[PDB]
Design a protein around this ligand. Sequence first.
Ligand SMILES: O=C(O)C/C(=C/C(=O)C(=O)O)C(=O)O
Ligand SMILES: O=C(O)C/C(=C/C(=O)C(=O)O)C(=O)O
Ligand SMILES: [Zn+2]
Ligand SMILES: [Zn+2]
Lengths: 342, 342
Amino acid sequence: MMIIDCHGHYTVLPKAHDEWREQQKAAFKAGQPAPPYPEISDDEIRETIEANQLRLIKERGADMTIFSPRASAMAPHVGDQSVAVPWAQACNNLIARVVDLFPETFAGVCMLPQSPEADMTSSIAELERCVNELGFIGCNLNPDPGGGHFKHPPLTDRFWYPFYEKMVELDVPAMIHVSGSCNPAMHATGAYYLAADTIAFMQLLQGNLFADFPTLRFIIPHGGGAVPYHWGRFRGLADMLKQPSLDTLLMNNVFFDTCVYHQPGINLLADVIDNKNILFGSQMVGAVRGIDPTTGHYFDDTKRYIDALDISDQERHAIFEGNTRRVFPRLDAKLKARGLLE
Amino acid sequence: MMIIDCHGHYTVLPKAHDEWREQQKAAFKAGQPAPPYPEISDDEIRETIEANQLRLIKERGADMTIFSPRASAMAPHVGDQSVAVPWAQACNNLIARVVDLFPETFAGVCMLPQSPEADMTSSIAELERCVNELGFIGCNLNPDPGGGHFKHPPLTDRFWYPFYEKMVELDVPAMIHVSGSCNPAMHATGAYYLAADTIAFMQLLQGNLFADFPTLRFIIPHGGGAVPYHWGRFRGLADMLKQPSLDTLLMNNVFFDTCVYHQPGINLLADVIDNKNILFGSQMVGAVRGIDPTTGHYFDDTKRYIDALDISDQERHAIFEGNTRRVFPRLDAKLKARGLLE
Ligand SMILES: O=C(O)C/C(=C/C(=O)C(=O)O)C(=O)O
Ligand SMILES: O=C(O)C/C(=C/C(=O)C(=O)O)C(=O)O
Ligand SMILES: [Zn+2]
Ligand SMILES: [Zn+2]
């Protein structure tokens, strides 16, 4: 069995990328056109990947990561589409370069040129660019470009439907993912991420999207936010609302990663969420890069937790490889084509 | 041993209470005066209590509930002061009455008259009355009076120092608690609630409030939100921020109730939170009022989950009686004068 980390971002980047974004943001304020993008060097990228992800991958024993842009640096709220298209384009192009340099190790997933004041029309074009052109396999979907006030329609809205249709056309899932927090009242990677996970879940709970899009597949990170910890709570509200059971309404279409940075959380996730819904990931080099004083191992080396479970090979296969190949059909294919058959 | 339920609102009310509130908002739109507040009978109060909470207190083996006005219905987001005050008293006076009519069973916690536009001015005044006049033992403190977009100072700000000083003086904890959400893309009791618990806790980990107010005690309900589920992540972020450990910084002053509506969630909280920091709670007759198809029993019969934990009798004593009598010294006091020692 492979070991496929379904959640991981290019977080430790070359100097000149983070340059142009800041100056890019800068010519928007000064009502200026932006300057040319720096032409990065192949081996500048190689360094960052070899020094970071590729090093931990090797030490932790993984096979590939599904790899998208730094999510905290997405920042759709800055500014309008003018800043956010060339900016998403720059970030995905880099994800594309990293796949080309290390295509045995990384599979492409794109962020969207979403902006508060716009619809999904450009995001559709970027997704078709990145799937049909650059060979990506899914996308990251920001349910709140405003940056920390959840001022957007639920995912059950028809605001998003034009986008779900193309997701269905291309056969790619979305990872529901928020970005940086310009809500001064909200820590991004401690509060904001975990809140948007639950809200999105509770949103779908309130509707029935997947009656409309039966093959639409979402991933909700961080082990679904606060959802498994409160699994019984969400089951009783399905009744309170007069809704179908969770297993029927959502859990053919919603999936949870394993970025829960301690054994008891991973224990609870496996106890309460069906094996088919659980995708391995750890987003290494992210929100918690330190050792855990209590376990002598890194907080984000989650594979250590899944290997601590008492689960079968059949279950263990599903978590590390199976679910993710079924959730990402385009990656399954590419792997079958290499003779890597499940 | 004594079984005290630290989280409970008055959800099934005399009908005039509700008919009136709709008129006070009906008036307030029509720039109209409020209608006279309906005179309500002790029995119309007895009936709803006797028929609802007391019937379940009996069946469930609980000795007394810390009792405050209904959460979904505080609604500081409607609209200004001249609403929030009279509404705040009308509700808190109801609790005071319930405590009289049932003073071996209900101890009083008050809802403050917070409004989006207002500082902790009236709220400070509603705390003196309710603890000195009416004899309450603690308060509920809304971190997002705006009611849906977290547009308020963090619990670390000096804006709340005045009222924090009132709590310290009188000697009363605060349950952090948000109310009804006016935000479609977000559902009050299944999302807003959980997100507010997790934000407040992280707002605190980012700061050092208890350095200023070393006796200030909060209670974060729903089992701390996503926090114990993600506890390793929060311990990690403490190092990421160069912050003291969480017990040092927080867990002498911060506590969690046991409002986790299924066995596995209760299993975890007790695994990772210090027994000293866990307070038995249920919020019966609130968010999830039905039975659980998988157990036969109610989702919200939380005592059953504390019962099924393998934990010592001391440890059991703290959750049902010890910790909350230490967290509400005015309760601690009243019980000892009834002869009820620990
Ligand atoms: O940007 C960073 O370094 C932090 C970060 C965190 C996450 O995505 C996550 O915890 O799931 C990211 O955006 O990649
Ligand atoms: O009002 C209602 O019916 C819902 C309700 C919910 C809560 O407080 C909770 O989940 O903790 C209440 O206000 O008691
Ligand atoms: Zn992420
Ligand atoms: Zn409550």
